[PDB]
Each structure stands twice: as structure tokens, then as C-alpha cells.
């Protein structure tokens, strides 16, 4: 049973209610999304930051237990070329859940992604046994979004 | 030039093209198929990760609007970065068991292939990156469980390149001719077959329409389908088909084309099955054809050997693609069974134009496949059509 720690504040949405299909029909991987209501992502668990896309809108991780999480700003947000994004971390960077990989400025965003809900999945759900969402208000870095048990 | 800057138009069109941009918004040149990439291999993240490659480029592009527009082939261009993810598949295929290995290629390969989508004729980065494409498709098929042969069929002085899926050289095995659309390339369906074809043990032979792949020398003419005639006349000299056994599944226009041979091929075909096939209506309408992409636009000139390109003029051209403007449908039926299909609001083929096709064939089903998940509302109907092939061909 490991508690994947909100990666930003906001509330909890469905994942298939994200206005893109690739993730909204589970794709990318399953979990939940978060209406956004802070500045920063942050780890959502202990672990290894895998990718950083380049425009500084997602990222993805491992934790040290083997569960593969990809954790992605907005929806579109790719065509906002970066705009809006401060990278922290690096690749392959070991983290605590907790730790901050990007900064964010919320007002633009909202002003200018076609939406702001943000995906966190786990991308390797053939590698997971079980999965439970959670729901309600998070904060970032403390409110645990969703449990897996690898 | 760059992709979307080859396409010569003329000054009165370029216009109209600048308006269709600024109207539709759009922060890319060519159309993004993120699902379509998916099924047919690509993984999810990655795909995600090159855009995000290639929309942070600050490097000049041809129109900001498209970010999808980089000059040059260095960071941030299209093909660029699409081979680099290729390379990184291919290089670490270098280090895998081998059945691990050609999945790898085979990945790669697609990669490739996208790298140089929608592949116009005039663009020398789509080609070598097509020429990385064919070489691991090569390379995934020595490396797997199954055959793939690469055929070369002679015909008007020069051949016809075919690629043969086995699932193993028992005992004959009824065979496949797939052809997908007209910005596709032949090798794009390793999925078709690994996933839903050998399963059932049947053979698939892929073939690029006339000024499509490996076709691209043979031009886009009124009988675009003698290409696939003369593989089926081909057959009968392959040791691993069973000729009398032939079906045919078409994606997008290779659809048009397959219900087109048959109607010339009735007695030698078993069944045929189309999906997302654009029979008649798009054909008869220039409003729409006008007011499509560039991307779209910069194919068709591309296939039809255009040297300058009149919006208007080729909306007019077009017409003459339409099976109902041809004959093929009117009066007489085929014998052949065709199974036609597409999505709920495909703008390029309306559950009508499976209809009409349904209509003009003996014991043929019209389905629709609607949108309530897509993805799952795809998997099904894909199955069933196989299933469909599977007892035809039996």
C-alpha cells in the first residue's frame, strides 16, 4: 500500500472527465486529475524523476517500489511552448515525495491552456495489482491523491 | 524548404490558405493522430515528450503558428526529432533478447515512418527517413518469431514492393491485401497483424497504393487499383497463400479502392472490409475540400503530380474520386461481401457512404462504430470485422 502524495493543490476530478481522449480513456495510464489551485508540482512519491518534457509542463517518475507515474499539467498545455513554466528538477534526479520539480504561474494558465485539469496516472498499470482513487480537496505535497499496492 | 513550404500555390491560393489558418486556430501544420499513433505502436509518453521537443524550439519556423514548422533538421524540427526517438529504439534494440529486440525495431520503424508523415514527394528529410523506416522494418522481421517477406512483383517496367506476414510456412494460408490511406505507409500495420491477423493464423500482405511508399513512382491515375490487381494476379505463384482464399481490408482510401477491385475481381476475391473509407460524399463537396488543412491539401497535390496548385481547380479534379462518379455503384451489385465501417462524425466517411457500398454488395452490412471511448469502441468492431474475414475466407 503506497500513498501517492498530491504533485499539486487543487481538487480532484475523474480522469475521464479531462477534455483530451488519449487520457481521458486511459491511455497514458489510469488515475485521477486535479483542478488546479496552487503554483508548484511537486514529487508525488519517493523515487527517481524520469522525464522532464521540455516545455516544463510534465514529468514523469518512479518510485523506489517500482510504480511508474506520469504527472501532466493542463490539457494542450504542450502548444504553450514552455510559457508559464519554471523547471526545478532534472532527470534522474532523486527526490522525496514532497520535493519540487516545477513552478508554475497559475493566472497565466488559466488564462491561456484550453484547460488547466492535470492528470497524475500510473503508466505501467500491467505491472500493478491494485488501484484506489481517492477524492475531495489536496494540497500539494501533503493530501494523498491515490493508494497503489505494486 | 520545410514540409509545409514545398507545395507550390499560387498567389490567389496562398490567400485562402492563410485564411483557413487564422480561422481554425490550430497551433500545428500537419494533423496530429495521437490516438491512431498509439494503436498502431507508438508509446503514449514519448509521443507526448517529441511534441514537447518540438513545440519548446525557439529555431525559426517556417509559420509560429506551427510549431510544427522548424526550418532545418537540427532540434526542434519535425523529422528530427521523430528519428532521434526512432535511434533511441533502434540503439537499444542493440541489447534485448530477441523477441524483445524486433519490438524494438519494429517501434523504431514507426517512428521513422511518422517522422516523415504525411510524406510528400518533394521532401528529402520524409525520404531518407522513410529509407530508416524500411531497414528496420527489415531488421524487426529477422529478429521475429514470425515471417515477413518482402516481395517484388514486376509490373510497368519496373516493380511493385509487397510485404508478406506469416504466421509460419505450414501448411497454405488465406491471405489479407491491406492498403491503408494515401499519407500511410505499408509497414504502418505491423499491429494489424500481430495483434489481430496471426492470431488466427492469417496471412497479411500489405501494398501502397499508386504515389504512396513504396508505389511513389507509379502515378495516382484513373485505375488506382491496378497496383493491387497485379498483386492478386501474383498470387497464384506464392507457395504460402492460399490464392483461392484472398480477402481485403482498406483504411481511408485504400478503401475506395478495395470496394473498386471488387468490383473488378469479383470471382478471385472472398470478402472485402473498409474502414473510415471516403466513397462518395467528401468527393461531392468542393466547399468542404477547399476549406480543409493545408497538410491535407499539400497531399493530394502531392499525389496527383501537381506542379502549382489552384485550391480551386483541385476541388474540382476531386470529384472524379467518387465510386458513384465513376460507375462502380448505380446498377449492378458485386458478388463479393463488403463489410464497411467508420466512427460516429468521421468528416471524411458518413455512415451514408458505408451505406451505399453496403447497398451495391451482395450480403454486405453496413456498421457503425460509435464514440463512447473510442479507443474501446474500436478494439470490438476491429474484432468483429475479423472475425467477419475469418469466416468468409472459410
Known sequence: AIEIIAPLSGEIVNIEDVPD??????????????????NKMVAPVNGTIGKIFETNHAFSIESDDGVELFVHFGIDTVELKGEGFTRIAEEGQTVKAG???????????????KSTLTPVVISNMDEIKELNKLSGSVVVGETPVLRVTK | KETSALTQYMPTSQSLLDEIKEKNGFSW?????????????????????????????????????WLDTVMGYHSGNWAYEWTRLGMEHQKRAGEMTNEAASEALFSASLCYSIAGYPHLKSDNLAIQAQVLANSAYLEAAKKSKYIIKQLEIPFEKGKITAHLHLTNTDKPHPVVIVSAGLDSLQTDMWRLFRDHLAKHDIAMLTVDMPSVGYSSKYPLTEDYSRLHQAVLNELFSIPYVDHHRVGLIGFRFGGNAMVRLSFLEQEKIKACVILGAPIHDIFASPQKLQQMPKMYLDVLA???????????????????????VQGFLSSRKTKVPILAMSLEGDPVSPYSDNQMVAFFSTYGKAKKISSKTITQGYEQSLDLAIKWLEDELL
Open chain 2, 29 to 65: 501544420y500537419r494533423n496530429l493522430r495521437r490516438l491512431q499513433w498509439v494503436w498502431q505502436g507508438v508509446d503514449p509518453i514519448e509521443q507526448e515528450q517529441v511534441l514537447a521537443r518540438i513545440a519548446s524550439s525557439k529555431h525559426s519556423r517556417t509559420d509560429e503558428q
Open chain 2, 302 to 324: 502531392s499525389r496527383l503530380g501537381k506542379s502549382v496548385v489552384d485550391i480551386y481547380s483541385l476541388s474540382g479534379q476531386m470529384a472524379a474520386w467518387s465510386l458513384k
Open chain 1, 99 to 113: 520535493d519540487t520539480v516545477i513552478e508554475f504561474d497559475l493566472a497565466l494558465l488559466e488564462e491561456k491552456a
Open chain 1, 21 to 38: 481522449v488519449v487520457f481521458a480513456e486511459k491511455i497514458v495510464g489510469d488515475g485521477i486529475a486535479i483542478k488546479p489551485t496552487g
